[PDB]
Amino acid sequence: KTKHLKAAFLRYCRKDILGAQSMVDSLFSDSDMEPDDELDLAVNQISVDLIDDYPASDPRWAESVPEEAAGFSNTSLILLHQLEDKMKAHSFFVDFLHQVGLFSRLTCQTKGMLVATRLLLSEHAEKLSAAIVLKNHHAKLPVLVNSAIQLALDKRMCTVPQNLTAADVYFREVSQMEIIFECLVDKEEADLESTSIDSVEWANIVVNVNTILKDMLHVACQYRQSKNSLYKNESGIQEPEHVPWTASSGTAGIRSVVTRQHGIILKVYPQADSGLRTILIEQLAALLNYLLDDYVTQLKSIDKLANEERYNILEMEYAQKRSELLSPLLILGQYAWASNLAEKYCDFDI
């Protein structure tokens, strides 16, 4: 219940300072229920509800201990450093789970995504707190306009100054600010006047969004190379980090995040009318993006067990008819990138 989550959130408050008291409030949490199938999924919905309050505003564990949690002013201009403090707060939070233990409880189905274990939601809230700092690092008038439109579509904003328009709640849900900064590249595109060779500046703004959605997917990938498991990607751990493991983010293939990627590929309509070097940089870019999508489908297919195989072989045909749709798209493109695409979904021989 709410009382239990609000007692663990108060034992994390003391975990920054000392461990002995908080280790007895985990030992008293072996006065738990102990039936695996749903009550361990009831301390799961507690560890998950705190990993949603550590990416949110000032997390509800704060007050008693005024750590790096503290109610940072929302009238400050310190938005980026304030959110770096929250990736550190969510990092000492994963450590003060790993020691106290916190070695169980596990995602099901969320937004068309199937996920093996709740512990993928800690990794998923971490990857989407690296995404936030990346688009906080890139702040310019086109992106901040595309943001203000997105936020006003989801709901109204308070007009008591406080106008980023906001971000702490659009970090727990930053995935939405990618399906809409695409719909604002398309309504910008309707006024791009790129009917033929006349438009130029307007095919430069469609690429500036393509670069940011791309390096945001680069950041989710490298934060899945910085693992902690001594079995899952040994490189980056106590073993040499000179060779990274599979450059996939271990994303579960969202049916709105994937759709906005297969939308911006079909903005290969610009490479029809564009100067020669420009058509290559957006082609290397759309190659760089698709080599994250084919990587997350590969990581998800690897995790499938032998029974229920009928669903596993149907998900294979679905990815194979998309590597087969990413190929006719690059049959007109440069085949210097075909050698790379073929190695990226490392078969795709046809």
Add this chain to the structure above:
Amino acid sequence: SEVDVEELKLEILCKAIKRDEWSATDGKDDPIEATKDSIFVKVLQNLLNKGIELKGYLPKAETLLQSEELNSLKTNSYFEFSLKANYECYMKMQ
């Protein structure tokens, strides 16, 4: 303590913001505090290499007591957005 040191310390740092002029350009904060900025760049003489306790040596200036004077001037609504914002990168400077 008789002639009020820390009252004047405020009077000046408050007219140091009135002359700055806190404004807004196209719905965005306008940091007029260019003089307040510069004065806090001028207090530090790099006394880290002079062997002085420069680290933690800006608690001369007040904070909650400042917005008391800002209310008297009627200017709290304009400048309190970047007063605190600059007071964050003045806790990193210090």
